[PDB]
Amino acid sequence: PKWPRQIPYIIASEACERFSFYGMRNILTPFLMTALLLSIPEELRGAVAKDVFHSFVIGVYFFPLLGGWIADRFFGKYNTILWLSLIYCVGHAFLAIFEHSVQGFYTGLFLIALGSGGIKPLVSSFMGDQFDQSNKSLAQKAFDMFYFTINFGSFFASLSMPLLLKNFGAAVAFGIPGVLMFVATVFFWLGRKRYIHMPPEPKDPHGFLPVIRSALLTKVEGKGNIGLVLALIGGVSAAYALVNIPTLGIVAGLCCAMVLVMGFVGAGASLQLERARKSHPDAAVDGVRSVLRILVLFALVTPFWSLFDQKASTWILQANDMVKPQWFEPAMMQALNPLLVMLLIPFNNFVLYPAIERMGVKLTALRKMGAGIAITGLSWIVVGTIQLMMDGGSALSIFWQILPYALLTFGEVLVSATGLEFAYSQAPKAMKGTIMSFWTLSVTVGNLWVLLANVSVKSPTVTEQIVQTGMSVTAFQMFFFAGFAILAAIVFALYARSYQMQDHY
Ligand SMILES: CCCCCCC/C=C\CCCCCC(=O)OC[C@@H](O)CO
Ligand SMILES: CCCCCCC/C=C\CCCCCC(=O)OC[C@H](O)CO
Ligand SMILES: CCCCCCC/C=C\CCCCCC(=O)OC[C@H](O)CO
Ligand SMILES: CCCCCCC/C=C\CCCCCC(=O)OC[C@H](O)CO
Ligand SMILES: CCCCCCC/C=C\CCCCCC(=O)OC[C@H](O)CO
């Protein structure tokens, strides 16, 4: 077997793109606090910074749906990646050019979310269909390299970019990733004559959505349709969220609508799924049933993303008020996660998991996902006490946030490295694209909670609850989020026992 000569041009493109993304995302929260949002009072500024960051993340893990659609329906993967990558480049440029204008900076974030998210499903799979049956032995080695560039990039970008921002300002700190991103596209363009382009996939008339549409619109004799009522309810509810945009916010409102719609339509279709058998194959309707069960699984995982994504926003804010060295910047703590990932992932699989299995435990992939959410919630118990403990008294940053990072990352390996691969085995191969699409929306919805948390916290009724606790609002939210994960981890274990009673033995 020989290495396809196109692979180096994709690994190289990925390397630069992953460096440029983590490069500007990891100094995004510091930049908002020190520079762009200075017109906001300090106490107020922390809440506005989180909104900007997490509204950005939301778009990053929402726009894969647009990207995958454009590639499959019209222009193909190569051409879609190329033009989304150029837009991605422009977005990075906007961040430098409109350094001092808020409207212009938000616009650049949008283009980055559009470019980075749009090419996220396309690039990895595009790399995949460059291997034939003879090559396939090497494909696993190629995707291994992908994994390395993610961590390599996220590690060094967390170290170098805070320093670059400190010494040179935003224009240089945001321009260097932009330069890097342009080189990323050049590498991808340099192998255009080499790439293998798979023929456009034929649309499935028995796909996930056509079955859903059948389950709602098909009328059975002498009965009503509860399912379609729920759909209309979600349509009504979404409208109630869309109208309340002035309170919620634009990105928060659009997600609330999206969640309510897909939430109520999904519920309604489940009630009436047997009606779909009239218009669709038995194997195809059964598959949708398999996916709908995975949906509930993913929904309970969303509080994990709420805690894991806040390390680049909330956790940085806390590190600002801790005891750090002269050379050290609070944003450099983010480098701990890729380091811990590359340590725990070989540790667990080789040393720890067989050691827990030696005790006798099964260690089902479903058992690990539930444990990971709890440990992630546990990590925020530690983050919460620290805030309490440092409300009066001073604790150093560099030693102390190593513990929450150790627990957070350990929960990430249990959940994030297990979820999608497990769901693939649970549903028919045809649903692989549908499963992947809801997995990325899982991250989006998780960050929606972060958005809705500090929206509800500004309401009069909630403040008095905070007043009664006699706790700092900052610390109160953390414990809320800690309990948010523990509760979901409980319900997860409750649903997981019913889940394994279903499809097979
Ligand atoms: C599900 C559909 C929603 C997708 C929206 C895509 C968003 C991508 C980038 C947005 C960046 C701009 C963020 C600014 C913002 O919302 O600020 C929040 C507010 O609290 C302060 O102005
Ligand atoms: C400012 C310029 C930055 C340029 C450097 C960025 C990254 C450059 C190269 C990244 C790594 C390329 C390795 C490719 C490779 O050998 O893949 C394996 C092949 O399949 C086997 O030979
Ligand atoms: C039909 C596109 C509508 C989508 C609306 C929102 C997205 C905004 C910009 C998407 C950019 C599309 C990139 C792909 C592309 O332009 O391919 C062009 C072909 O290569 C032309 O031969
Ligand atoms: C009180 C709910 C708070 C909001 C949570 C997020 C969204 C909620 C539900 C969306 C995803 C679940 C819908 C799919 C579904 O009903 O599957 C059911 C299966 O048929 C199980 O038998
Ligand atoms: C949650 C299941 C029912 C959703 C009905 C459609 C609602 C309209 C917009 C909500 C956003 C989610 C779109 C669904 C989706 O991810 O489709 C996946 C495709 O099958 C992927 O190839």
Residue numbers in the entry: 8 to 512
From the study:
Proton-coupled oligopeptide transporters belong to the major facilitator superfamily (MFS) of membrane transporters. PepT1 is a member of the POT family of proton-dependent oligopeptide transporters (TC 2.A.17), which itself belongs to the much larger major facilitator superfamily (MFS) of secondary active transport proteins (Reddy et al., 2012).
The existing inward-occluded structure of PepTSo (Newstead et al., 2011) was found to be not suitable for constructing a repeat-swapped model due to asymmetries between the N- and C-terminal halves of the protein, which led to steric hindrance problems during model building. First, a lateral helix between H6 and HA is resolved for the first time. Second, the residues that make up the cytoplasmic thin gate adopt different positions, such that this structure is inward open (the new PepTSo structure thus resembles the previously reported inward-open PepTSt structure). Fourth, a solvent-accessible cavity is observed in the new structure that permits protons to access the ExxERF motif on H1. The resulting pore profiles confirm that the central cavity in the new structure of PepTSo is accessible to the cytoplasm but inaccessible to the periplasm, hence the structure can be described as inward open. The repeat-swapping method was applied to both this structure of PepTSo and the existing inward-open structure of PepTSt, generating outward-facing models of both proteins. Examining the structure of PepTSo suggests that the kink in H8 is due to two prolines, P345 and P353 (P329 and P345 in PepTSt), the latter being highly conserved across the POT family.
